[PDB]
Amino acid sequence: DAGKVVDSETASICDAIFQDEETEGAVARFIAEMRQRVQADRNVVNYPS
Amino acid sequence: MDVLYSLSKTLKDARDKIVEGTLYSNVSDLIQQFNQMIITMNGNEFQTGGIGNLPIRNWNFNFGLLGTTLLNLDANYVETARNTIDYFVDFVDNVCMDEMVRESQRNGIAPQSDSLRKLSAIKFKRINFDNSSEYIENWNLQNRRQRTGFTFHKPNIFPYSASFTLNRSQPAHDNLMGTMWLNAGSEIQVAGFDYSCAINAPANIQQFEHIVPLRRVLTTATITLLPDAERFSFPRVINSADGATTWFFNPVILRPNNVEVEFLLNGQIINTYQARFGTIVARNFDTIRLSFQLMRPPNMTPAVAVLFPNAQPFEHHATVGLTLRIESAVCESVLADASETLLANVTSVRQEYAIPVGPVFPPGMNWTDLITNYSPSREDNLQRVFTVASIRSMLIK
C-alpha cells in the first residue's frame, strides 16, 4: 500500500525480517500491510518504527 | 475468561472451516488465528483437576504450525490439523470442567482454577479473537459495568413453593377461607377459596391477594394470564398447617372477579392489567401482585342455589383462580431457563466428579435453594460457571 517507515534503520530491519525464513507469517503479512497516517488537516503524522 | 472463550472459538472454527476441499481463501485468516494460538501456547505447562474425583492431568504444548499452500485443502492437511485440534479440545474441556467445579465466597467472579488464572496472564491476550457469543458479550459488558441482558424462554425465576394460607379457619376445617398457590419455574398458579361462598361477607364479595416478589428484576417479559388454576380444581385432602390432622377440600370453580394483575418495581405500579386475559407484557418489574375476588352470584338457578346454603354444611367450596406464565423475559442476572443447558452441564460435571459441597452453592446445585437465596456472591459464581459452561458447550456435545 505504498507504505513508509520512520527511519532508514527501520526500513533495513524490516527488509531483513521480511526476507528471513524464520519469520512468522503473521509478522511478514504485517510488515507488508503496515501503513503510516498523514493527517494534514490536523497537522499530524504517525509512522511505524 | 476471554482467552478461554477464544481458544474454544478458534478450535470450533478450525473443526468447521478446515475441511477437505475448501479454498485457501476461506481459511487464510483462520489459519493466522490458529498459528497465533499455537505459537502463544507452545512452551507452557498446565495442570488441571485435583478436586474431588476429577483426575490431575498435565498438558504440554509443542505443536507445529499449519502451512497452507494447496489451492484446495486435501486429506493430509485435515488430518494434521485434527491432530492438534483434538489435543486442544481436550485441554479446553478439562480447563472448563476444572473451572466449573470451583467457587469462592470472595471475588467469586474471578477465575478459580489455576489453569484459568494462568491463562489470565498478559502473554495469552494475543489469542482473544472475537467475543460473539451471548454469554461472553454479557461477560465483557458486565466487566465494564454496562447494562447486560440475558434472554430466557420460561425463566426459572420463582423458587418452588406449594403452600396455602387460611385467613379463616377452625379445628373442624369445615368452613375455610383463604388461598392456595404453586410457584414453580416460570408459572404461578393461585386460587382463592371460600366455603361459605361469601354469603356473610360484606357486599357478597371476598377479596384475595397473592404477592410474589422476584429475586431479580425482569424486563420486556411476555406473560400469559389465564382465568383459572387447574391445579386447585379437584378434590384434595391436605395436611393441616402444623400437620396434626388433614382437611378435605372440594372445590367448585367460579370466574374470578375484579381481576387486577400489577407488576411493580420499587413499589411503583409499572404495569397494571384489569380483567384482561391472554398475552400481556410487563416491561420492567420486580414483584407481581395478583388480586381477585369471589363474588357470590346474584342470580342462581336451582341447581346452583342447592350448592350454596347459609347453614354450616358446605359440601362444595367456591373457588376462583389465576394462572400466570412467563413465556419469555430478559434479566440482567444469570438464570436457569427451559432452553439453555448450562445449569444441567454444571450440575452434571459436579455430580459426575463428586465435588464436595463448597462454601457458596447449595448441595447439588439445588436450583430452588440457589434462587431462594440468590446472593451477590452466588450470582457472581453462577455467572462465572455458566459462562465457562457455555464456552465448553461450543466443543463438547
Add this chain to the structure above:
Amino acid sequence: MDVLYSLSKTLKDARDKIVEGTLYSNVSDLIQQFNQMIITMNGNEFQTGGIGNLPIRNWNFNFGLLGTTLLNLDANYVETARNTIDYFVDFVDNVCMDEMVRESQRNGIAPQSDSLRKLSAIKFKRINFDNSSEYIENWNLQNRRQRTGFTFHKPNIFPYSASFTLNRSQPAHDNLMGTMWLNAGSEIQVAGFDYSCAINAPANIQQFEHIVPLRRVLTTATITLLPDAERFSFPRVINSADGATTWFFNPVILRPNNVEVEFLLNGQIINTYQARFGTIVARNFDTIRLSFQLMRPPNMTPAVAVLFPNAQPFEHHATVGLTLRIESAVCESVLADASETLLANVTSVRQEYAIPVGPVFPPGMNWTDLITNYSPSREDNLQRVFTVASIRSMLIK
C-alpha cells in the same frame, strides 16, 4: 465522575498549597495539573440547573495559565490563582448539585446531569489526576467489577422498626407472652416477656427468638452485646396489634438465659457466641439470629416468690432482654453512618431546591424506606449521589 473528582481535587490542592511565600518546588507539579485543567476547560460552555428551583447557570471557560518562572510565589501569584479557583469551585459546586438532584431508574450509575455527560467525553480525560479518596476508589473498583469496601462507624443498616409479637394473647391482654423489639440504625434492642414467668412451660423455660435480616452483607464488624434491653424495662401502655384497645406492660427484668447470638450468611452459621457479652467480631454475615430464654428462677426469696403466683393475676411480667450495637463495620454497598454527612448533603440539596419526587428514591430521601427496599437501581443511584456529594464536600462545607 473521575473527571469531576479530579477537578475538585486539583482545586482543593490549589487552594491549600498555593499560599504566598511557598517555594515553587512545592507546587511545580500541582501547577502543571492546574494549567492542564485550564487548557482543557478553556473554550467550553456548560449549563447547569433547571431542575426544581435550582437556578439555570451558564459557565464559559476562558482563563490564562498560571506562571512558572518564580522561586517563591508572591501575592500576585496567589491573587491570580484564587480568582480562577473561585470560579472553578463554583462550577464544580453547581455540577455536583445538578448531579445530586437527579435520578434514573435505568442506568443509575451513568451520569445524569448534562454537564457531567459532557465531562464524560474523552477530551476531558486528560484532567484525571489521582483518585485517592475512598468513594472514588470504590467507584473505580465497581466500574471494573472488583471488590468494594466502605468502612462505617455504626452503619445505618437496620430499617427503623418498633414492634411487638404476641405468641400468646387473649382479649383481656392480662396473660401475654412474646417479644418487643426496636431496630434502628446500628442498634437492635429486643426483649422477650412472659406474664406467667414460665410457670406452666416445660422445664420452666420459655424460648424467644429474634431474626434480623440485613439488606446487605456486612464484613469485619465489631459488635457490643449487652444482656439487658433498657428500652423495654419500664411500665408501658401499648396499643393493641389492631389498634382496638390498649394493654398494660409492667416488666420485671431477669437475666437472659442460654443466650446465643449467631451471625449467618445465606443461611449458614458463620459466627456464633454462646452466653458471651462485651465486644465480639462478626467476620461476614447478612442475618442476625438472637435466641434467649426466660428461665423461671429455681429458688426464690419470699420477696421474689410473691411476684410470680401460680394463679392468673400476674401483676409483674418477667422480661429478659438483649442489646446489640454494631459499632463499626465494612459493607460492599454504600450506606449512611454516624460520622459521614453524604446522606445529609444530598437530602439538604434536594430539600433546599424543592426537587420533585422522582421514580427511584422515596420522598424526602427517607432513609428508613430507602434501606427497607434497597433495590439494585436504588443502590446504583445512591452510590452515584453519595460519590458526587463526597466530591462536592471536598470543596464545600
